[PDB]
Structure formats: structure tokens, C-alpha cells
From a paper:
Mycobacterium sp. JS330 produces 2-nitroimidazole nitrohydrolase (NnhA) that circumvents 2NI activation, conferring 2NI resistance by hydrolysing it to nitrite and imidazol-2-one (IM2O) instead. The initial characterization of NnhA indicated that, unlike most other known enzymes that degrade nitroaromatic compounds, NnhA is a hydrolase that functions without catalytic metal ions, molecular oxygen, or other cofactors. Despite low sequence similarity and limited occurrence in a few soil-dwelling mycobacteria and Actinomycetota, NnhA maintains the α/β propeller fold characteristic of GME superfamily enzymes and forms an unusual hexameric ring structure formed by a trimer of domain-swapped dimers. The residues in the active site of NnhA appear somewhat conserved in comparison to the ADI and DDAH, with the catalytic histidine, glutamic acid, and cysteine residues present in NnhA as H260, E197, and C357.
We also crystallized and solved the structure of an active site variant NnhA-T2I-G14D-K73R-C357A, in which the presumptive nucleophilic cysteine residue had been substituted for an alanine residue. To investigate which of these cysteine residues is likely to be the catalytic nucleophile for the reaction, we substituted either C352 or C357 for either alanine or serine residues in addition to the T2I, G14D, and K73R mutations. We found that despite soluble expression, C357A and C357S substitutions eliminated activity. On the other hand, the C352A variant still retained activity with fivefold lower catalytic efficiency than the base NnhA-T2I-G14D-K73R variant, and the C352S variant also retained detectable activity despite its poor soluble expression that prevented protein purification for detailed enzyme kinetics. This suggests that of these two cysteine residues, C357 is more likely to be the nucleophile in NnhA, fulfilling a similar role to the nucleophilic cysteine in ADI and DDAH that are conserved in the same structural position. The two catalytic mutant NnhA C357A structures solved in the H32 space group also adopt the same hexameric structure. To better understand the reaction mechanism of 2NI hydrolysis by NnhA, we tried to co-crystallize and soak 2NI into both the active and inactive (C357A) soluble NnhA crystals. However, no excess density for the 2NI moiety could be found in any of these structures. The only notable difference between the apo structures of the two variants was in the conformation of D262 at the active site. While D262 exists in two rotomeric conformations in soluble NnhA, only one conformation with a slight displacement is seen in the structure of the C357A mutant of soluble NnhA. Hence, it is possible that D262 has mobility within the active site, which may play a role in the catalytic mechanism.
Author numbering:
A (entry chain A), B (entry chain A): 11 to 379
C (entry chain A): 226 to 302
């Protein structure tokens, strides 16, 4: 469009004869997401909801991606094994890690999903040490309305990283920031949605109430939904993972949607209030295998491509069969090296764009019981 | 610092023998600004308060900087003259505009203040037309805690511009975003502070309550102050400026600190509640000349370099004498071309860094009446 | 307002409150005034004569929402 060709008709709130007051008022009333954020970006964006995923980012590991090679980990493996709490499965194997990364990318390509690649500097560091956990790009997933700078609860190696990913998203995709979390703890990228307007959080090492309130207030205003609901799990876990029980600080390890009103769910996830809410709202629960969960095979860390189709860890045999039994297609992907730190396959995927999908009303209206 | 030289002692919350819970809790308790935002940026930043200004940005005008040369202005001068409401003083003169820009920069340099320069693309445009008002870099001033994406109330030509300036600040200065305003209207960069923890807003074309609440909640958490106060003016004005009265939608045209508990103030600014609050809190008021105000010479659009020293428009002779009479040094700078649109000298300065300065308690404790 | 609302002979009673920028009775720099009767007055059903120094944004919004037509007084007068 030519620079001298612009006319008043190109301003949506303009109309012939409008008064100053009326024009200003119309401007105050405009929707941020659809008037400002998306037009200025030149595109739609946000991973909210349970609709069709179209666009993600992965990190291809280098030696610096390996948590067990940080000088601080070498100084005290037990300090980090406390924070993370995941079972010890041996040193990370860089080459096998690279191979399961390729395998995941091929699965995305075979399912029509665009994959961006994120690289970090050589010898990447924040003010407090080598980066750690920076393979887990879910921590930088993009919301309707924009990116988020997180307050990490347990992993100091992620300081600087949500900034890096949000800046990457702005420079590479033109996607703006929505909010920085500035109190408590909130790691929104490890949360998941079970309907278009329903968010699952935890109260845990990774989330306190003040952090949660700050995040939810920001994303609810750009959610593109009339209502916004937060289901809050209350897992019994000190750090990230409780290897005695399978309980986890992160929603994405506790629960995930597999279809409209169908969830895969950990045995260590649901307190009575959470169970009641899910019952009242007509959600069908597929319980993950208890051993797969407790051993941290991440059977609930599935990535919903669209209602009825998920990527899952190939060795979660029992949970995956239960998912298929519930009518859901499973794309099996190797995910073993990734689980030597605090996450699985879904945890390592930065979600950029998911198309609007089924609503809580849809879930409530499904006749199944 | 070497990549393999990092130790646990370099994590502030770490100490020998700390439990997982205790380490996580210490991390949840850390101050965002001083633990995360500033260390990750590698510097301090924010224009909050009335302390010593050290760092700003200006825009050197090109033909595209001129509001009266937008194709939309050419289509209807009266539409934009409605929105802005400033007196017609003739076409903007590009060369004279460039010269008063140089003069302002020289004043900064002579006062030990670093000046960055911001350029826009050729033929700069947002989704709704040519940029307009983008010389007014105050709209991108940086807060303690980070940058802000604004919701402009009256000027569609500024859509995209607060984004551009915040992205510039991140890429050029490594200064992160704090928040996007996503409801109503809020133009925080045109607000001013009259003590370290006291912000002046308006309710006007440029600010509604919902926008205000969103902004204040965000900046109060990173303010670095125990309390945070918002004085809210209620000017009688439809657009930006009321040429019958001198009333203005923007705080920076209504009022500004010139020293500790000394303010320059428009005759059209103070309703009874605002007057009462200022009286109770021991603020001395220097009233701007009524004619200078009403004619939009911007006598309150002074820039505080530090308590007791301001830059002011050279032709605000009467207001400037009153400022000198109140013991304040005035640096007179030409500012005539700038005032053909919605702002003066302070309005065109992006403030990046101001050192912490006097508090509300300081103001209250000054003995003067 | 509490006293006059009880004898108003009306189901509801509303108070629109202007917030003029004036120290005493009158601000000769602006035309702002401490008294409503100098700021605004009805001239017909939902038609008001109104000073340029009278209406803050909230007052303007309320009058707009309630369908009042504003005739602006001459600024010099
Ligand atoms: Cl109107
Ligand atoms: Cl768009
Ligand atoms: Cl403890
Ligand atoms: Cl620092
Ligand atoms: Na916020
Ligand atoms: Na009485």
C-alpha cells in the first residue's frame, strides 16, 4: 500500500461526521489483540486452547544444552537432583539426544506443522551461571496477546532464558510481549489448557498465588473468550518431581487434554476439589499408568496436535494403549534423553500458534457418561 | 567469567545445607528488578521519580516525522485538529524543527546527559496509516522494571510505535518489557512523577480507569518503593488540548516537579481533590502563566534534569521567571515547531535512566510554608 | 442529596458531579466555576448549554450514555 494512498477510511474507528469524543471512545473500546497486537505483528499467534497446532519451535542440543555438564552440576549433582527430583537414568548422551530431536521434528513435518529452530550462544550463561534447562522451549510458549517473561521457581539456570525466547519471538516472528511476571513464581509455559478458556495450573515450587494471579489477569484480557477459568492442582511435591509418587510441580506432567472433554491424568494429580470440578464439567479422565508416571516416563507430557491426535513418548506403552482405547491417535516419538532433566516431549516444544478450538461449552455438551 | 568457573556460590539464594524447599522459597522471595531484570539486562534503568536524569533518546525529524504531511491529515486537517486541539501556528518547517532538535541535544550534552538517536523506516506506517506523533519519544519512556506497550486514546498513528520503541530498547539497550496495556487507554510516558513513589495521571482521552489500574499495578511492583501513590487529575478537555482553557489530556502538559516538593502547575489542572491532596502533602505550587498555558506554549512541559534544574521552552518567559524566583535553574531551549502537534520539549524526550531521588517523605518533611 | 432525594417525588435520584479546576468561585484564565449554574444548564428536554471548562471525561461519558445533547457556550463569553 502506497504511503500517500492512506485515507481516513483505513482507520477502523473513523466514520464521516464522528465527533472527537466518539472517535476516542471507539478507540478505548477496541480489542487489543485484534486491533493492535495482531495487526502490528502482521500475523495471528498464541497456543491457547485445544484446537489445531500449526507452528512450534525446538532447540537442537549442543554440549552446552546438557544439564549434567554445567560446572555447578559437577560441583553438586545432589543439589540439582534435589531441585529436579527426577530419577537418575545416567549421563545424558548428546548424540542420542540429537537423534530423538530429529525424530520429533520429522513427526512435526509429517503432520504439517512448521518447526522453527532456536540456538543459544556458545558457552551460554546468565548472571548466576551456565544456562540450565534451556532445551525446554515450552517455557517460552506464546499466548494469545503475546509472550511472557516467567519467574522460575526452582531453576536459576532459566533466569534470562524466557527473556531470550521472548526477544527471539519478537525479532524473528514480530510477536510482542504481553507481560513480565514480577512476583512470586509462575512458569506459564508448563501449564496447559483443557478447553479454549480453561487453564490448568498448580500451586507448587513453580507457581504461587501472587504469580498465578498476575499471569491469569494478563492472559484473560487477550484470551479472546468471554470467560476464563483456572483449575489449580495442589500436588504433594517439594521440588519439580516426587519420585516416590509421580507428583509434579508442572501441570504438563500431571494432566493434558487428548480430545474434547477427554484428559490423560496422573494418579498423583487430582485432589478432591479438582476431581469434583472436572466431574461437574463433564471431563472424561483416562488415567496414566501408575508405574510409567512414578518412574518419570512422562506419560501425561503428550502434545495435542488437534482434538483426537497426540504425540507421546514411545515407551509409555500402557498409557498410550489407554489413549488409543479412548479413540485418540497416538504418534509415538522417542523421548528418553530429554527425561534426564525436568521435562519430556511436550515440555521441550515452544508452541507459537494454535487455531481456536473447542470450548468449555463444547465439553459440557458432549454426551458420553 | 569462564564458563567452567561458575560455582553454587554464584547463585545468591544458594547456601551450604539449604533444603530444596528453602532454596525454592528464597527464589520466590527474590526481588524481580534486582535479581532478574537488571542483572539480565546488564544495567540499571527507569525514569521513575525526581532524581538525576542521566540518559535519554531523541528522534531527528525527517519529512515523514511531520504530522501535517500525512496523507490522512491532507485529507482532513480538521479531523486531526479536533483530536489534538492545539492552536494552528502554520505548517511545520522541517529545517527549523531539525535545528531546535540539535539545540536540545546540545543542552543534554552540556549537562552530562547521554543522548541516543531513534530513526524510523522511510515511509513509516502502521496498519492504519502513516505514523503520526512518533517524534514524541516520551511515549516510550522506560520504567523501573522495563518498557511498556501503550494503548493510545486519540492518535491512531501511534499504534505500532510504542512496540517499535520498546523493541528498540530491548535490542539496543537490552532493556526488557514490563507490560502491555490491553484495555481502555493508558499513555504512561506522558505521565510524570512528583516524588520517588508519586505518579500523576489524568482521566482523559489518553487514560481510563481500567488502563490506569493495569499500568499502576505493573509499575508499582517494580517501583523499588514501599508505597506507590497515583494522583489523578480530571481535566475538562475532549481531545488532547482545550485551546479555550489550557486544559490537557496529558499530565506532562498540566504539571511537573521543578524541585523537591515544588511543582510548576497549569491553572486548568487542579480540581479541588487534587488541590487538597497536594496541600496535605506539603507541595509548593508555582502557577504557570495563564496565557502561555492557554496558547499552548507548553510552560509545564519542562524536563527535570535534577531537583532544582529544568529544561524549558525559551519563549515561556513569564513561567520561566517564576521558576527562577522559586530557586530553580532554567535551561532555555527553543521549542516552537514541536508544539504544532500534541506536545512540547519534555514530550519529545524518551527517558531511559534517572537515578533514585527524593521521596514523598522528603517532600512532607521540607519546612517552607 | 439524602434530604432532597426523600422528598423529590421520584423513584430514583441521580447526582452528576462536575470537578472544575478553580480555586475560588471563578477562574478567569479558563471560565471554570465552583457553581453548577455557571457551568451548565438545561435549555430543553435532553438539551444543555455547557461551558468548555465544565466537563471532565466521566461527566462527558455519563451525559453521552444518557442521551443529552450539548450546546457549547461561546468560549470567550
Ligand atoms: Cl459527542
Ligand atoms: Cl493480523
Ligand atoms: Cl525445609
Ligand atoms: Cl545490574
Ligand atoms: Na499485568
Ligand atoms: Na438530614
Amino acid at each position: 500500500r502506497g504511503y500517500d494512498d492512506w485515507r481516513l477510511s483505513d482507520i477502523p474507528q473513523y466514520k464521516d461526521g464522528i465527533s472527537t469524543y466518539e472517535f476516542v471512545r471507539a478507540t478505548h473500546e477496541a480489542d487489543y489483540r485484534t486491533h493492535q497486537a495482531e495487526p502490528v505483528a502482521g500475523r495471528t499467534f498464541g497456543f491457547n486452547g485445544i484446537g489445531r497446532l500449526t507452528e512450534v519451535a525446538l532447540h537442537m542440543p549442543t554440549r552446552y544444552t546438557l544439564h549434567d555438564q554445567s560446572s555447578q552440576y559437577k560441583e553438586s549433582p545432589s543439589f540439582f537432583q534435589g531441585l529436579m527430583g527426577v530419577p537418575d537414568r545416567g549421563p545424558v548422551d548428546l548424540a542420542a539426544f540429537q537423534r530423538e530431536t530429529e525424530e520429533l521434528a520429522t513427526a512435526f513435518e509429517n503432520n504439517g506443522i512448521k518447526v522453527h529452530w532456536v540456538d543459544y550462544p556458545e558457552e551460554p550463561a546468565n548472571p548466576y551461571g551456565p544456562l540450565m534447562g534451556h532445551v525446554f522451549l515450552s517455557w517460552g510458549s506464546i499466548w494469545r496477546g503475546g509472550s511472557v517473561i516467567s519467574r522460575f521457581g526452582f531453576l536459576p539456570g532459566m533466569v534470562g532464558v524466557s527473556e531470550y525466547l521472548a526477544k527471539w519471538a519478537w525479532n524473528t516472528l514480530n510477536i510482542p510481549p504481553l507481560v513480565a511476571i514480577t512476583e512470586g513464581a509462575m512458569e506459564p509455559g508448563a501449564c496447559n489448557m483443557i478447553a479454549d478458556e480453561v487453564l490448568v495450573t498448580c500451586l507448587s515450587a513453580s507457581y504461587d498465588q501472587r504469580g498465578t494471579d498476575q499471569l491469569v489477569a494478563a492472559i484473560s484480557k487477550t484470551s479472546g473468550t468471554e470467560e476464563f477459568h483456572n483449575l489449580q492442582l495442589r500436588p504433594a511435591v517439594e521440588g519439580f518431581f516426587n519420585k516416590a509418587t509421580g507428583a509434579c510441580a508442572h501441570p504438563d506432567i500431571n494432566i493434558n487434554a487428548i480430545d474434547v472433554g477427554k484428559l490423560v491424568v496422573s494418579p498423583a494429580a487430582l485432589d478432591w476439589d479438582a476431581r469434583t470440578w472436572l466431574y461437574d464439567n463433564n471431563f472424561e479422565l483416562i488415567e496414566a499408568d501408575p508405574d510409567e508416571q512414578r518412574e518419570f516416563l512422562a506419560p501425561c507430557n503428550v502434545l495435542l496436535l488437534e482434538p483426537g491426535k497426540v504425540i507421546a513418548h514411545a515407551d509409555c506403552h500402557k498409557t498410550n494403549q489407554k489413549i488409543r482405547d479412548a479413540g485418540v491417535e497416538v504418534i509415538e516419538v522417542t523421548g528418553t534423553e530429554i527425561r534426564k532433566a525436568c521435562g519430556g516431549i511436550k515440555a521441550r516444544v515452544m508452541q507459537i500458534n494454535r487455531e481456536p478450538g473447542p470450548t468449555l461449552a463444547d465439553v459440557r455438551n458432549r454426551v458420553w457418561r
